[PDB]
Amino acid sequence: LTEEEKQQILHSEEFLSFFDHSTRIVERALSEQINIKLSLNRQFFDERWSKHRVVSCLDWSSQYPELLVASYNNNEDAPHEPDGVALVWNMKYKKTTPEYVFHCQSAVMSATFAKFHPNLVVGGTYSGQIVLWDNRSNKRTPVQRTPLSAAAHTHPVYCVNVVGTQNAHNLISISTDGKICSWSLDMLSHPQDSMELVHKQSKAVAVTSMSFPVGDVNNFVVGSEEGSVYTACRHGSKAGISEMFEGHQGPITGIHCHAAVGAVDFSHLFVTSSFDWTVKLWSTKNNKPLYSFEDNAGYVYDVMWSPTHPALFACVDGMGRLDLWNLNNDTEVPTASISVEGNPALNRVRWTHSGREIAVGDSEGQIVIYDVGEQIAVPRNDEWARFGRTLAEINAN
């Protein structure tokens, strides 16, 4: 009745779950009923959270599919708004509003999911902290943050990914100083395996949105200051920068290894999307450019291999052209290309864990997901190796 009783009960630590379930149920009843080749599936736009906020990185959820963490680098537009946005959206429900907003105290960079964790959104920030969000809470402030000590992270964490099974689940988050740190997915106040990727020349290698081959190895493809992909480890004597893939002329922007094997060989091959304006196919044991794709108009901000079709990849540019390239049929032309409205500098490319769907992180705000059914796991295991062999035969003129 009175404002004191209403405001005390509305802000009581009883209505947090009530507001969460009320928003969940009313948003669940939002699907209006009735009582009487690239698809260009859907665009993601948020008003209080996705406008002039470039997308830091996207990430598909291996557990609870059709979920992607749209990390956002909160620009200098709204300082009163909590810097850094991590919006989770839903595809299966087909909603226009973000499911759960995950703001922070710093511009979130490369926020991804945490494997074998149902309510754990992990993510680096502009303050060098890999903040952690819980889906159970209603307060969208991250309850778990990362220290900034000498052993901890210093640079803004531009790439955080998990490595290891249920026995030794590691949270490998890397800074551009080469400081890689394995963190626990429960407590975030102390690192588990902290070190620096020491190099012969220029130890602090500006790494950029690394990945891991399928199998969760400690080796990550370091997108260095000028290509120079350093497949590096975390433990043992090979810890730190181990192998260098040079023959590139620009800082890598999005680098992803082999996704889940669909119907071909393991294909221990990664791919480099960079500022060099051309995507480049590489192998994890080549140290020679296996194939350099066409010089796309603008940079190549991201790239990703589809788990359904592990022989193709999607890449982007500054003009706004998402280009997926398969090499079983094509040799120097893209397979399927589609653009986004206007000319957005498409920042990210993330294929869904189930494949045949592409999450494209646009210029600022909006996130456009694509759907395809044409490129499936066709059992061309031999033709892929044969085309890679012909690439290794024709590249040496």
Partner: protein, 93 residues
């Protein structure tokens, strides 16, 4: 973010007003005409109790989660929870 909840759930078309009434029959969360919806909130809560008796009497281990009352002029969707309830009228838009 209570005002954010009101603005976002009211942003959907058809929703005439987010008149969330608690179990006490008092309009704890409302945005429409209070005297007109006060009787509606008390009546709808009494029939919410009727629906609770319906669910708890037809089956012993059943719990009422969500109710849809498609009326002739509107679609009164009731969102009952374990502690309180919610009343939201959404026309067939």
């Amino acid at each position: 973010e209570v005002e954010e909840t009101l603005k976002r759930l009211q942003s959907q078309k058809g929703v005439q007003g987010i008149i969330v009434v608690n179990t006490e029959g008092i309009p704890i969360k409302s945005t429409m005409d209070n005297p007109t919806t006060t009787q509606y909130a008390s009546l709808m809560h009494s029939f919410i109790l009727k629906a609770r008796s319906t669910v708890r009497d037809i089956d012993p281990q059943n719990d009422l989660t969500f109710l849809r009352i498609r009326s002739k002029k509107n679609e009164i969707m009731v969102a009952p929870d374990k502690d309180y309830f919610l009343i939201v009228i959404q026309n067939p838009t």
